[PDB]
Write a protein that binds this ligand. Structure first.
Ligand SMILES: [Zn+2]
Ligand SMILES: [Zn+2]
Length: 507
């Protein structure tokens, strides 16, 4: 919904146009994470609602792969200090799998975004620059140098930070002979700039080539001008008083005679109980649709803390419930959230096997993917008639539950069936109650879990047995623990004669 708002605020603020332009951008200096993805998603959701009003939109995702190589992350060979100063799109790939350093991190992210079904126009600074797509706007930068410096000192002073150095140029240079950054020394009134290469050297370079890059403060608003960016969310750090945005909101005006696009602050994203987290990490246990929904369910300035542990079970339940309400297959605002989280138009409900139950079924080794699917059918969680998408969705989720149990689930919920019963105190009352449950199971090949579960309380009530004594005993005889999986659906999933013989304390 907050995306529809900002949509109204965009049709209002900006004039009513034919096609709008939304933008997101990242520097591939390392692994683009779950926090960076929030920016692209925010641009996509607003762009999505914009189409929901009949307008047309272009979502530009800009890769600042032309930024210099400042620092060497962890896991990246230390022997790569030699490439600092070079643009990332020309720095080698530490692992060899790709052409550049920037490519390794860009490919991973673009692939992670596809599985989410989110479409965008990927642009590369390195290509736009080289092609001279920025020749003109770059010259203006030099033509309005004093103006730019004026603006940056205007804000630097509010924060009592010292003014820009006297011989400051709004752009840098990449030495053609060594490709490392270099301070610009001189300029004309058109093209050509002189630079003083680090160490010992001098030289001239033509702006019309691609070795004259606009420093970020100018480089951003120029970009908003070149393309017609109408909306572009950004990190808190760029929206702080005299930061990127405020300083660009002026440069684009006083230099490119344009109004800056509207913006929005998106907050932090992480996992509970907690070293970078990528979309790949969430994929190990979260369906792509779930990921999308999680980002559409929060307000931009409320941080997202995903519980990949025990709280993942209620996550799926709430998600499933909303999907059911959306298709009316179950008894208002969440409704539009479901639409906005989906890149494509909602087709129909797809078989939903309760995550918490797969976590249980997946811990019974004598069960194949087929067996699991069949259990789900008998206990009626998924229709008997499964489409292609349905079996495709249930199989993936089964794998997601198997992954969650191995790596994210707390130790408490792990269990294993005891092939033989343990020696445990069992009162005459419980004994007779288990005998009644076994008889009911022996005379009822078929039944619904819901009723089986009612029968389990009935027998306990008739004999006068508390919950802790009743359930902790059944859990102990079956899995050797005091607590365990929801009882009714658990027992129904096991070999029937195994449950009967165990209840009868004879096997
Ligand atoms: Zn690579
Ligand atoms: Zn040089």
């Amino acid at each position: 919904h907050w995306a529809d708002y900002i949509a109204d605020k965009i049709i209002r603020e900006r004039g009513e146009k034919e096609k709008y332009v939304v933008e997101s951008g990242i520097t591939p200096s390392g692994y683009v994470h779950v926090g960076n993805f929030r920016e692209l998603f925010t641009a996509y959701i607003v762009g999505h609602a914009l189409r929901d009003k009949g307008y047309e939109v272009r979502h530009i995702h800009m890769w600042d792969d032309y930024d210099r190589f400042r620092k060497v992350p962890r896991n990246v060979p230390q022997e790569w200090k030699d490439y600092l100063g070079m643009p990332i799109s020309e720095v080698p790939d530490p692992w060899g799998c790709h052409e550049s350093y920037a490519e390794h991190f860009m490919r991973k992210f673009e692939e992670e975004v596809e599985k989410l079904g989110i479409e965008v126009d990927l642009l590369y600074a390195s290509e736009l620059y080289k092609r001279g797509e920025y020749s003109e706007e770059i010259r203006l930068a030099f033509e309005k140098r004093d103006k730019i410096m004026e603006i940056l000192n205007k804000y630097r002073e509010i924060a009592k930070q010292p003014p820009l150095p006297e011989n400051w140029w709004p752009a840098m240079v990449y030495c053609p002979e060594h490709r490392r950054e270099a301070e610009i020394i001189e300029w004309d009134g058109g093209w050509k700039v002189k630079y003083k290469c680090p160490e010992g050297h001098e030289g001239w370079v033509d702006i019309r080539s691609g070795n004259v890059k606009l420093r970020w403060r100018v480089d951003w608003p120029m970009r908003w001008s070149h393309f017609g960016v109408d909306f572009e969310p950004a990190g808190k750090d760029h929206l702080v008083a005299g930061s990127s945005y405020d300083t660009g909101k002026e440069i684009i005006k006083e230099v490119y005679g344009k109004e800056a696009p509207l913006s929005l602050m998106y907050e932090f994203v992480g996992i509970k109980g907690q070293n970078v987290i990528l979309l790949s990490d969430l994929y190990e246990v979260l369906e792509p649709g779930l990921v999308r929904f999680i980002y559409a369910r929060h307000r931009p300035n409320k941080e997202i803390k995903i519980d990949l542990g025990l709280g993942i079970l209620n996550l799926y339940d709430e998600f499933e419930k909303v999907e059911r309400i959306y298709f009316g297959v179950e008894g208002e605002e969440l409704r539009r959230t479901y639409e906005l989280s989906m890149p494509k138009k909602p087709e129909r409900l797809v078989a939903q096997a309760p995550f918490r139950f797969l976590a249980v079924l997946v811990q019974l080794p004598h069960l194949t993917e087929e067996d699991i699917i069949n259990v789900l059918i008998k206990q009626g969680h998924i229709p008997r008639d499964l489409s292609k998408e349905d079996v495709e969705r249930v199989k993936l989720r089964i794998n997601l539950a198997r992954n969650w149990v191995k790596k994210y689930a707390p130790e408490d919920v792990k269990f294993s069936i005891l092939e033989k019963p343990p020696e445990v105190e069992v009162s005459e009352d419980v004994r007779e109650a288990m005998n009644e449950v076994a008889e009911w199971l022996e005379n009822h090949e078929e039944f619904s879990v819901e009723e089986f579960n009612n029968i389990l309380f009935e027998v306990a009530k008739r004999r006068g047995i508390s919950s802790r004594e009743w359930f902790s005993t059944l859990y102990r005889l079956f899995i050797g623990k005091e607590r365990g999986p929801r009882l009714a659906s658990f027992l129904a999933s096991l070999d029937r004669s195994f449950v009967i013989k165990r209840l009868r304390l004879e096997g």
